[PDB]
A paper describes a structure:
However, exceptionally high-level aminoglycoside-resistance is achieved by the action of intrinsic and acquired 16S ribosomal RNA (rRNA) methyltransferase enzymes in aminoglycoside-producing and human pathogenic bacteria, respectively. These resistance determinants block drug binding by catalyzing the transfer of a methyl group from their cosubstrate S-adenosyl-l-methionine (SAM) to the base of a defined target RNA nucleotide within the ribosomal A-site. Here, we describe detailed structural and functional analyses of one of these enzymes, the kanamycin-resistance methyltransferase from Catenulisporales acidiphilia (‘CacKam’). CacKam has a SAM-binding core fold comprised of a seven-stranded β-sheet with a central topological switch point, characteristic of Class I methyltransferases.
To assess the relative contributions of these two interactions to the observed β6/7 linker structure, individual D21A and W203A substitutions were created for further functional and structural analyses. CacKam-D21A had an activity equivalent to the wild-type enzyme as determined by the resistance conferred in E. coli to kanamycin (MIC >1024 μg/ml). Crystal structures were next determined for each CacKam variant to assess the effects of the D21A and W203A substitutions on β6/7 linker structure and crystal packing interaction. Despite the loss of a potentially important crystal packing contact, CacKam-D21A crystallized in the same space group as the wild-type enzyme with essentially identical unit cell parameters and crystal packing arrangement. Critically, the CacKam-D21A β6/7 linker adopts an identical extended conformation retaining the double cation-π stacking interaction of W203 with R43 and R73. Thus, only direct disruption of the interaction of W203 with R43/ R73 through the W203A substitution is sufficient to induce changes in the β6/7 linker structure and the crystal lattice. Together, these structures indicate that the R43/W203/R73 interaction is the major driver of the novel β6/7 linker structure observed in the crystal.
Residue numbers in the entry: 8 to 226
The structure:
């Protein structure tokens, strides 16, 4: 269930309850990578319960080590790294998110987002409270060669194609009322995708497709 160092242990239902009650706000990152991005949201907002959810738990191990240390040594006790896929999220993670974030997704998470697949979008909808925003950010440079296999068979997602492909309708039918979709050129990449193999301040930027939606009633 939950990362505790380099070992994943079980999270006591009670402790998971107190942590929720104790938090000003709950933020859920689906698809976290090595989870440095989730770690920094936790450091910047110690009162947020930041929850990183992703099946590939071995990659979040270093983040978990650094987060387990004492406060003065860069520890972050408000960071919860959950080992789970979004398509079959456990019932304890149902309706907890004040905000759901999908920051530069890869693999199935990325493909399900571009295609508007029921299992990914409903899993994302399952974790959110009514009114909670869905923030999806995808770097557009994934559509230059070589285009990643998980999306190589699709056309480039633009603000205009999001509507004409019916993605905006599939989102609304699954409980996601789209509010805004736009391209933001020259976006500092360190804002939505940190990494322990990357140094902050490199100033690397990219064009990023943003999509905000709000959790409503499914059809």
């Amino acid at each position: 269930k939950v990362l505790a160092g380099k070992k994943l242990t079980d999270l006591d239902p009670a402790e998971w309850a107190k942590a929720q009650a104790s938090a000003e706000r709950i933020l859920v990152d689906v698809g976290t990578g090595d989870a440095r991005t989730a770690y920094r949201q936790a450091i910047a907002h110690p009162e947020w319960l930041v929850v990183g959810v992703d099946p590939a738990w071995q990659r979040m191990t270093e983040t978990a080590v650094r987060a387990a240390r004492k406060p003065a040594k860069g520890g972050a006790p408000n960071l919860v790294l959950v080992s789970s896929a979004i398509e079959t999220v456990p019932a304890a993670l149902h309706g907890v998110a004040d905000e759901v974030m999908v920051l530069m997704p890869w693999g199935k998470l990325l493909r399900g987002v571009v295609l508007g697949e029921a299992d990914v979008l409903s899993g994302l909808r399952a974790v959110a409270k009514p009114g909670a925003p869905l923030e999806i950010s995808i770097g557009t440079s994934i559509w230059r060669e070589p285009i990643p296999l998980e999306i190589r068979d699709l056309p480039e997602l633009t603000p205009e194609t999001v509507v004409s492909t019916g993605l905006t309708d599939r989102l609304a039918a699954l409980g996601w009322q789209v509010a805004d979709v736009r391209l933001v050129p020259h976006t500092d990449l360190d804002t939505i995708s940190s990494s322990w193999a990357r140094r902050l301040g490199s100033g690397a930027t990219e064009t990023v497709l943003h999509l905000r939606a709000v959790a409503v009633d499914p059809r």
